[PDB]
Each structure stands twice: as structure tokens, then as C-alpha cells.
Amino acid sequence: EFLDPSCAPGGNFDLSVWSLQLPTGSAGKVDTIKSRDLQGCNGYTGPTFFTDKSNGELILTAPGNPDITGCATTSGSEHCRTELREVDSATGQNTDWAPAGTNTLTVAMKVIQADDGSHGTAIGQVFAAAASKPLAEMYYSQKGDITVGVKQGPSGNQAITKLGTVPLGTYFTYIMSYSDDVLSISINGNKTTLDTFSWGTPNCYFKSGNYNQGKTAVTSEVHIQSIAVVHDQ
Ligand SMILES: *[C@@H]1O[C@H](CO)[C@@H](O)[C@H](O)[C@H]1NC(C)=O
């Protein structure tokens, strides 16, 4: 369970359940690293996704407002990211799951610099594949306030709930759960059950990393110490 400073992230974390979306791109489409290329001690590394040479942890950076920085955005988004997108462990293909049974994402993270978006940097998501929209988008502000925006059904705006406060530079553990049709997030074991409004049990998938919401060019920086996905149906 010791991370290896000499390995790429694929040697220190199970990246067989992830692909990586980057803030660079070509043809207005962002570069994506397939799971097969992330995996292993000799897997992908780049300028925004690399191993901390002091301790083996994962460092993810992302640039601010693309209108200023020129960074690449996914379709439908106006913000740049270095962010992991869940895939099927067997095939490497994009996946999603029903919120029946148990679906959790547990991450130990610290934020070194957050962006100046309304709520700060997005550090985890439950994405509703069924509506091509986020169900829950968790944010970390420059004051260390952790919040979540939950769309009021697929056509509604995000309702914001405060989840906790953690000072910048301090490690914390989050758990995002959408299980037995109940959405909840815990921060250091403090659990908040969240209203899902008019959402009709959408198929979803997890995202985790650094999705920079900045109004200005401010960079964001996230470090990850552990990341685990559980599906038990
Ligand atoms: C969890 O709740 C306790 C008790 O209200 C509080 O002292 C602590 O700051 C909370 N944790 C976070 C990360 O906000």
C-alpha cells in the first residue's frame, strides 16, 4: 500500500476503471488518454497529470478560463479539466450504472490552489449519462468550503448544499454515493444526504480530479493519495 515515487500514476492507482480527459486538444475536441495507456508503472504521464516525486501521490493541474488561456473544452462545457472519467474495467469502454445497489467513489485528496469560479474547483462528479448532464458536481473553494451542486432534474439549475470546510493544503476523504437510489456525500465521515428533485433514477458514472471553473486564468492544483470505485448490485 506504499506508493512508488518512481512510477507513473498507473503503477500507484488502479486506473483500469478510468480514462483521462485533458486540457489540451485538437479540432475543438479534448485529448483523452485511454485506460490501457494510463495503466501500469510505465503508463501515461504529462504536464498536468504526473507523480509527486517525493511520495508517489498523483498531481493534477488545470488552467483557468479558456477564453483567456486557450485550453481545450469538451462538448457542452466552457471549462478546462484534467479529470478521470469512469470506464468498464474489462473493456476500457465508457460505462455507466444504475443507482440501484451500491455505487461509491472514495478519494483522499488535498487542494493546493483552487480557482475563482463561483464555488471553486470541481473535484468529483456523479454524471447523468441518461440526460448528458451532471447529477452532482462537488466544488472546493479558495476558502476551503466544500459544496455540491445538484441539478433540479435534467432541466433545472443547480441547488447548492454546503458539505464541510477543509483548509487548503490539508488532506481530506470524500465519498460520493448513489446507492439504492439515494445520493449522498461524506467529507471525513460527515455524511449529507442530498435531494435529487425530479431526476428519474438516471444511469450515471463517476468523474474525479480537477475540473477548473475559473472566471480568470487562475490555475488549480489537486493531489490525490487514494481513489477507489465500488459497484455491488
Ligand atoms: C464534521 O462535523 C464536525 C461536527 O460538526 C465538525 O467539527 C467538522 O469540522 C466537520 N468536518 C468538516 C470537514 O467540515
From TrEMBL:
GO molecular function: lyase activity
Gene3D superfamilies listed in its UniProt record: 2.60.120.200
Keyword annotations: Lyase, Signal
Disulphide bridges, residue numbers: C7-C41, C71-C80
UniProt xrefs under InterPro entries: Alginate_lyase_2 (IPR014895), ConA-like_dom_sf (IPR013320)
Domain Alginate lyase: 13-231
Glycosylated sites: N190
Name this protein carries in UniProt: Alginate lyase
Species for this entry: Trichoderma parareesei
